[PDB]
RNA sequence: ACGGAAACGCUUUCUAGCUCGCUAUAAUUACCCA
RNA sequence: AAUGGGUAAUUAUAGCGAGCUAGAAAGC
């Protein structure tokens, strides 16, 4: 059998992030650290990598014993999610990202927003000379909200590990509330809420009404 | 499994037999030693060596000479064991004939099944482009790795691609990505693929584990030096030197 | 779980006052009554055009007409008798004591620094402000990090090495990286009915005299708490957040003996809880490791407004007195005394 | 007028035709115009750039139409400025927007105008 | 002036002809010029050259002329970046571009002045 | 009464797998000019 | 002593710039 579920969550944003992109024609007094935006629509996304690779990194450093040191090291309770690609079996994801595109582009207009970016003046004090060093670093602002998507495969060769493995994503998806989904981080730019963790098969028959007692948790 | 799974076609050939039977003798002396002793002697010399000896030269290789003598020598056979066996012959026909009478091979690399009619006029092609490239040649696999038997054997089977094992078969790191991607530089080639590879290699050198370090330095200091040697004959060594050691190391 | 959260609640005695780059002109305000109005000017100029009368505008904004009451933009609207304000923009209320001028003539401040804002139209406090607030602390009070980050007189030799601080990648290194493992978050934002834009007031010694400066920037007012996060995630990094209550009074001793003394107690505050000294305005030796600053600072500036010797000049301003946060008459306060205490949750 | 193959000649012999101080040979043609009004200048439109980057030209030409409000401004402050406005033809190239292609030149025109002044002097 | 023949050669010895460090004799007769004062301006010429086999030149003309701003102002930044384009003649290479083939020499020329940079220390 | 007549160099095949645009960083410093 | 106004500096700095697996196989 095969089936594929589908996880319906909104990012909520806590102090916005930067998800950095680079331009070699930005400016001379105006913007040298943007963030990434879709082309057509001018919004910022959330890209579905900054996801997988910083829940990669969370559950790296909990659902590991061996130190890894690198990928294709990991414990096989998440080279069976994100796969690796040096083990025979385990190359194809079974996880499926998504970019995580901006949804409220209207009920941010609501509020009094001229734009859906904010542009922060960042200056760095010399501790020797007091001097300055400005900058102008882009980020999106607190109340977005981003349709995240992430897509679950069943074969028949999860025998038992499909309801194993939502303690892995339910497990990166509460610590990417305690970390700062790229960004400056150490400097706010990070916090989030997983706002309507509501999972539901889109490929296939699968009963879901077991699943999603342990998203509410 | 340390090899690609073909075989190979080599047609020798002595170059300008028929002058080293007509004239033959008489450049040494004033037309005094063309005779007739020494004719003979020469003739059932050669077919001594070009009938019999073709058998010890290809004793205990994976090989099957189909056609030998005379001068022309047509020889099939598993790869590894038909390059060697090329090398031993001409290092054995200079040790025989003095340094005189160059021979001149031509290789072609097959895959399986395909017939031994597009195969061996394949080869000839190949075998009478190594005779037009100078009197003395080997056009291994392809109409443009022409070469010389006294620089294919000593610079790039055994000099260039000793080293290119000795560096790669000691390392954990550098895989075969780092092999395509140099040959692909090596035969691409304009003026400006000589300062991406000195950013590349330069770039790869401390990328690696910092403890063997000096292992990548030498080696890539050595790679640049056949890059840019700017004699047109350091090159293509060091691309057909690449391709024999990205063949040996197919999976 | 090692992210040891925290929870920061900072205190304003002192008004505080946070970048934001831009700031008004002289004819970018309303004062009608004790709201300064700051429209959106662009608007503003959208509404008076339709009367043909921004060409008038054009004359006025060149007008360097003396007796300041008629400068203002409140003149012009008393003037050509546009009677609306129903502009843009945010509309805060006086300070009502930095216009040390004659009553009446009153209102005619010059030059307002934005304070920083998202883009709702609230402000807010960023984290990075109190982390390099946090890190002056880190770096003055841990002894090891004052000695050799100097110098060493490499370009013209005014420049600090910055790399005295585990920072980096550092190839073949484990990831040490001291400052990533202290995550300052943003605080909450609050509303505008706590901004007063205080006067900058320069107290001087060797002329004992509190001249002011003609720079008016927006601030906080005093006595609001404010939040915020530190949620590290290295016991290394534990041990310096839970050091700061220790740390932030070694700082203030070593300080207080060292630049507030030789001004007298009475401009200085007291602190009722751990002291800090968040930005613009609490001068350079709050921004600097000065116990190594001392000889550098001064060779910047050969300018026409050199430092007076050295430790030059102390920075005070005017707010509504709130208690009883002071211990002097007037209300001069010191632009950027704050005071937090820390608890792990 | 300015168009995209010269508005940096355009703004380069216009800070070669910037006054200096005749007097005071100290660092000499030195200007009477400095860094710091220069980039008060720059500050006026760097938030249009980025504007004309992400929104349209419909809901920002009130902007635009405070913006030459903003430099009549700041040349009737100090006489070096007054001047700048003169021999670059700012005021003259602010009439002539009617386009985002225009507008993003016209930033690109201030930003060559603060380059070719921090590269000389 | 810079051809197909030797554009490469003109940035090895423009990079070989360049000052070294004086002190600092960790990694010594090093460079003044960082690594990031040089790609933060081959990144301009990354994103165009890889724009000009897409796009046709006259509706990318904007970005070379954003080319003469920006070098002009990473040079009048710090003397190492002013050193480079006085060595390597860079504004002298974009005075002359004017079409699609030598636009993209210039492009890879900028490649070779990074490649040789980051070969010689 | 063309060493000719008839005859697809054709079928199958994902440029694929893995990878945080990231690390540090207070929009601040100096004190005045007519 | 009042009265007019602010003036100068930095506009991002140092890094990384792709790595590895595959390099055509099975048929007529």
Redesign the pocket.
Same mark, same amino acid.
């Given at each position: 059998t095969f089936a594929k579920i589908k996880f319906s969550a909104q990012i909520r944003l806590e102090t916005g992030?930067?998800?950095?992109?680079?331009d070699a024609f930005?400016?001379?007094?105006?913007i040298?650290?943007p963030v990434?935006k879709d082309p057509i629509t001018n919004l910022p996304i959330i890209?579905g990598?900054?996801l997988?690779?910083?829940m990669?990194?969370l559950l790296?450093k909990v659902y590991n014993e061996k130190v890894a040191e690198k990928?294709?090291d990991d414990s096989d309770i998440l080279s069976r999610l994100?796969?690796?690609?040096?083990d025979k079996r385990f190359?194809?994801?079974r996880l499926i990202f998504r970019d995580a595109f901006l949804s409220n582009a209207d009920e941010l207009d609501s509020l009094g927003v001229r734009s859906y970016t904010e542009v922060?003046?960042?200056?760095?004090?010399?501790?020797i000379t007091?001097?300055?060093?400005?900058?102008?670093?882009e980020r999106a602002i607190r109340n977005s909200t981003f349709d995240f998507e992430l897509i679950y495969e069943i074969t028949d060769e999860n025998e038992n590990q499909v309801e194993e493995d939502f303690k892995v994503i339910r497990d990166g998806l509460k610590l990417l509330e305690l970390d700062?989904?790229?960004?400056?981080?150490?400097?706010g730019y990070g916090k989030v809420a997983f706002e309507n963790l509501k999972a539901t098969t889109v490929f296939g028959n699968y009963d879901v009404k077991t699943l999603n007692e342990l998203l509410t948790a | 499994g340390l090899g690609?799974?073909?075989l190979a076609v080599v047609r020798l050939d002595v170059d300008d037999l028929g002058a080293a039977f007509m004239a033959g003798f008489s450049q040494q002396g004033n037309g005094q030693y063309s005779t007739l002793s020494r004719s003979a002697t020469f003739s059932r010399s050669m077919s001594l060596f070009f009938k019999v000896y073709i058998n010890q030269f290809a004793s205990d290789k994976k090989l099957s000479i189909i056609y030998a003598g005379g001068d022309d020598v047509f020889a099939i056979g598993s790869w590894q064991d038909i390059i060697a066996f090329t090398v031993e012959l001409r290092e054995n026909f200079i040790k025989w004939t003095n340094g005189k009478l160059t021979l001149s091979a031509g290789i072609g690399l097959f895959?399986? $099944?395909?017939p031994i009619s597009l195969m061996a006029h394949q080869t000839g092609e190949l075998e009478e482009a190594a005779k037009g490239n100078e009197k003395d040649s080997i056009s291994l696999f392809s109409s443009d790795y022409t070469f010389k038997f006294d620089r294919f054997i000593t610079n790039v089977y055994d000099d260039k691609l000793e080293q290119i094992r000795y560096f790669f078969n000691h390392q954990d790191?550098?895989?075969?990505?780092?092999i395509? $991607?140099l040959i692909e530089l090596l035969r691409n080639h304009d003026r400006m693929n000589m300062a991406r590879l000195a950013?590349?290699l330069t770039?790869?050198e401390?990328?690696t584990r910092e403890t063997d370090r000096d292992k990548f330095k030498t080696f890539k200091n050595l790679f640049y030096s056949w890059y840019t040697n700017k004699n047109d004959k350091d090159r293509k060594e060091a691309e057909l030197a690449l391709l024999l050691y990205?063949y040996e190391i197919?999976? | 779980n090692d992210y040891r959260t925290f929870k920061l609640s900072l205190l304003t005695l002192a008004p505080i006052?946070?970048?934001?780059?831009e700031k008004y002109?002289?004819?970018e305000f309303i004062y009608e009554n004790k709201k300064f109005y700051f429209p959106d000017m662009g608007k503003f100029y959208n509404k008076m055009v339709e009367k043909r009368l921004a060409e008038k505008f054009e004359a006025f904004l060149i007008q360097?007409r003396?007796?300041?009451?008629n400068?203002?933009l409140i003149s012009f609207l008393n003037d050509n008798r546009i009677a609306e304000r129903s502009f843009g923009g945010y509309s805060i209320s006086e300070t009502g004591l930095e216009s040390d001028?004659?009553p009446n003539?009153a209102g005619?401040i010059?030059?307002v620094?934005k304070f920083?804002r998202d883009a709702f139209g609230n402000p807010y406090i960023?984290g990075?402000?109190?982390?390099?607030?946090i890190?002056?602390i880190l770096m003055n009070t841990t002894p090891k990090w004052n000695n050799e980050n100097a110098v060493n007189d490499f370009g013209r030799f005014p420049k600090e090495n910055?790399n005295l601080?585990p920072?980096?990648?550092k190839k073949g290194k484990e990831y040490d990286?001291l400052?990533?493992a202290?995550?300052v978050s943003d605080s909450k934002p609050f509303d505008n009915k706590s901004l007063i834009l205080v006067q900058?007031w320069?107290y001087?010694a060797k002329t004992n005299?509190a001249?002011?400066?003609?720079?008016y920037?927006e601030s906080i007012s005093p006595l609001t708490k404010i939040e915020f996060e530190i949620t590290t995630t290295t016991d290394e990094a534990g041990r310096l957040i839970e050091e700061l209550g220790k740390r932030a009074q070694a700082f203030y001793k070593d300080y207080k003996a060292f630049f507030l003394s030789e001004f007298p107690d009475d401009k200085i505050q007291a602190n009722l809880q751990y002291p800090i000294?968040?930005?613009?305005?609490?001068?350079?030796?709050?921004?600097?490791l000065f116990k190594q600053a001392d000889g550098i600072?001064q060779r910047?500036?050969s300018?026409?407004?050199?430092?007076?010797v050295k430790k030059?000049?102390l920075?005070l301003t005017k707010a509504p007195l709130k208690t009883s946060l002071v211990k002097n008459h007037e209300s001069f306060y010191e632009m950027?005394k704050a005071n937090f205490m820390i608890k792990e949750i | 007028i300015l168009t995209d193959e010269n508005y940096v000649d355009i703004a380069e012999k216009a800070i070669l035709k910037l006054e200096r101080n005749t007097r005071n040979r100290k660092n000499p043609d030195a200007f009477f115009?400095?860094?710091?009004?220069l980039?008060?200048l720059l500050?006026l439109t760097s938030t249009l750039f980025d504007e004309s980057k992400v929104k349209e030209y419909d809901a920002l030409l009130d902007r635009i139409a405070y913006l030459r409000v903003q430099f009549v401004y700041q040349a009737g402050?100090?006489i070096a400025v007054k001047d700048l406005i003169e021999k670059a033809q700012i005021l003259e190239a602010l009439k002539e927007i009617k386009d985002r292609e225009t507008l993003q030149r016209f930033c690109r025109y201030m930003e060559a105008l603060v380059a070719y002044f921090?590269f000389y002097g």
């Amino acid at each position: 059998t095969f089936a594929k579920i589908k996880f319906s969550a909104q990012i909520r944003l806590e102090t916005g992030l930067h998800i950095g992109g680079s331009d070699a024609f930005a400016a001379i007094g105006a913007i040298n650290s943007p963030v990434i935006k879709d082309p057509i629509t001018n919004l910022p996304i959330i890209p579905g990598s900054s996801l997988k690779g910083k829940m990669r990194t969370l559950l790296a450093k909990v659902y590991n014993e061996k130190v890894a040191e690198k990928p294709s090291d990991d414990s096989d309770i998440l080279s069976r999610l994100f796969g690796n690609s040096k083990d025979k079996r385990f190359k194809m994801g079974r996880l499926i990202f998504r970019d995580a595109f901006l949804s409220n582009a209207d009920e941010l207009d609501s509020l009094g927003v001229r734009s859906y970016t904010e542009v922060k003046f960042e200056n760095t004090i010399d501790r020797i000379t007091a001097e300055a060093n400005p900058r102008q670093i882009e980020r999106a602002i607190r109340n977005s909200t981003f349709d995240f998507e992430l897509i679950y495969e069943i074969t028949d060769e999860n025998e038992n590990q499909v309801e194993e493995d939502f303690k892995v994503i339910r497990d990166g998806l509460k610590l990417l509330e305690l970390d700062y989904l790229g960004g400056s981080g150490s400097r706010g730019y990070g916090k989030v809420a997983f706002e309507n963790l509501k999972a539901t098969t889109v490929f296939g028959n699968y009963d879901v009404k077991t699943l999603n007692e342990l998203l509410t948790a | 499994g340390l090899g690609i799974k073909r075989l190979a076609v080599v047609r020798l050939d002595v170059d300008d037999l028929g002058a080293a039977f007509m004239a033959g003798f008489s450049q040494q002396g004033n037309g005094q030693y063309s005779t007739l002793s020494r004719s003979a002697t020469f003739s059932r010399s050669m077919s001594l060596f070009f009938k019999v000896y073709i058998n010890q030269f290809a004793s205990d290789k994976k090989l099957s000479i189909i056609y030998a003598g005379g001068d022309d020598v047509f020889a099939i056979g598993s790869w590894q064991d038909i390059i060697a066996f090329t090398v031993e012959l001409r290092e054995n026909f200079i040790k025989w004939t003095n340094g005189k009478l160059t021979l001149s091979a031509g290789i072609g690399l097959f895959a399986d $099944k395909t017939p031994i009619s597009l195969m061996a006029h394949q080869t000839g092609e190949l075998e009478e482009a190594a005779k037009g490239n100078e009197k003395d040649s080997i056009s291994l696999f392809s109409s443009d790795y022409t070469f010389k038997f006294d620089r294919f054997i000593t610079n790039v089977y055994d000099d260039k691609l000793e080293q290119i094992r000795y560096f790669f078969n000691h390392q954990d790191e550098r895989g075969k990505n780092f092999i395509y $991607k140099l040959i692909e530089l090596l035969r691409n080639h304009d003026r400006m693929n000589m300062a991406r590879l000195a950013y590349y290699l330069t770039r790869l050198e401390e990328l690696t584990r910092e403890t063997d370090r000096d292992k990548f330095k030498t080696f890539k200091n050595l790679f640049y030096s056949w890059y840019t040697n700017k004699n047109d004959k350091d090159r293509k060594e060091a691309e057909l030197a690449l391709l024999l050691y990205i063949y040996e190391i197919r999976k | 779980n090692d992210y040891r959260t925290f929870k920061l609640s900072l205190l304003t005695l002192a008004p505080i006052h946070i970048g934001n780059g831009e700031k008004y002109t002289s004819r970018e305000f309303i004062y009608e009554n004790k709201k300064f109005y700051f429209p959106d000017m662009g608007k503003f100029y959208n509404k008076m055009v339709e009367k043909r009368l921004a060409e008038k505008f054009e004359a006025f904004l060149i007008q360097t007409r003396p007796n300041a009451r008629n400068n203002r933009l409140i003149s012009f609207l008393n003037d050509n008798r546009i009677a609306e304000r129903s502009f843009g923009g945010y509309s805060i209320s006086e300070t009502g004591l930095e216009s040390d001028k004659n009553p009446n003539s009153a209102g005619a401040i010059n030059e307002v620094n934005k304070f920083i804002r998202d883009a709702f139209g609230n402000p807010y406090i960023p984290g990075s402000s109190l982390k390099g607030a946090i890190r002056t602390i880190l770096m003055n009070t841990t002894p090891k990090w004052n000695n050799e980050n100097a110098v060493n007189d490499f370009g013209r030799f005014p420049k600090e090495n910055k790399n005295l601080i585990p920072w980096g990648p550092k190839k073949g290194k484990e990831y040490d990286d001291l400052f990533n493992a202290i995550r300052v978050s943003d605080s909450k934002p609050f509303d505008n009915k706590s901004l007063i834009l205080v006067q900058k007031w320069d107290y001087s010694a060797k002329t004992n005299k509190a001249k002011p400066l003609p720079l008016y920037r927006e601030s906080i007012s005093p006595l609001t708490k404010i939040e915020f996060e530190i949620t590290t995630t290295t016991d290394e990094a534990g041990r310096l957040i839970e050091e700061l209550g220790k740390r932030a009074q070694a700082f203030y001793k070593d300080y207080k003996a060292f630049f507030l003394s030789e001004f007298p107690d009475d401009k200085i505050q007291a602190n009722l809880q751990y002291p800090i000294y968040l930005g613009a305005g609490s001068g350079a030796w709050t921004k600097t490791l000065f116990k190594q600053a001392d000889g550098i600072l001064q060779r910047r500036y050969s300018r026409m407004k050199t430092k007076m010797v050295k430790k030059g000049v102390l920075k005070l301003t005017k707010a509504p007195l709130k208690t009883s946060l002071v211990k002097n008459h007037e209300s001069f306060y010191e632009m950027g005394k704050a005071n937090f205490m820390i608890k792990e949750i | 007028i300015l168009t995209d193959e010269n508005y940096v000649d355009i703004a380069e012999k216009a800070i070669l035709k910037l006054e200096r101080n005749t007097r005071n040979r100290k660092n000499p043609d030195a200007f009477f115009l400095t860094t710091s009004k220069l980039r008060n200048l720059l500050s006026l439109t760097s938030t249009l750039f980025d504007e004309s980057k992400v929104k349209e030209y419909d809901a920002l030409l009130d902007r635009i139409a405070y913006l030459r409000v903003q430099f009549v401004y700041q040349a009737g402050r100090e006489i070096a400025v007054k001047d700048l406005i003169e021999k670059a033809q700012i005021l003259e190239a602010l009439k002539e927007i009617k386009d985002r292609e225009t507008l993003q030149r016209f930033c690109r025109y201030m930003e060559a105008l603060v380059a070719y002044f921090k590269f000389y002097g």
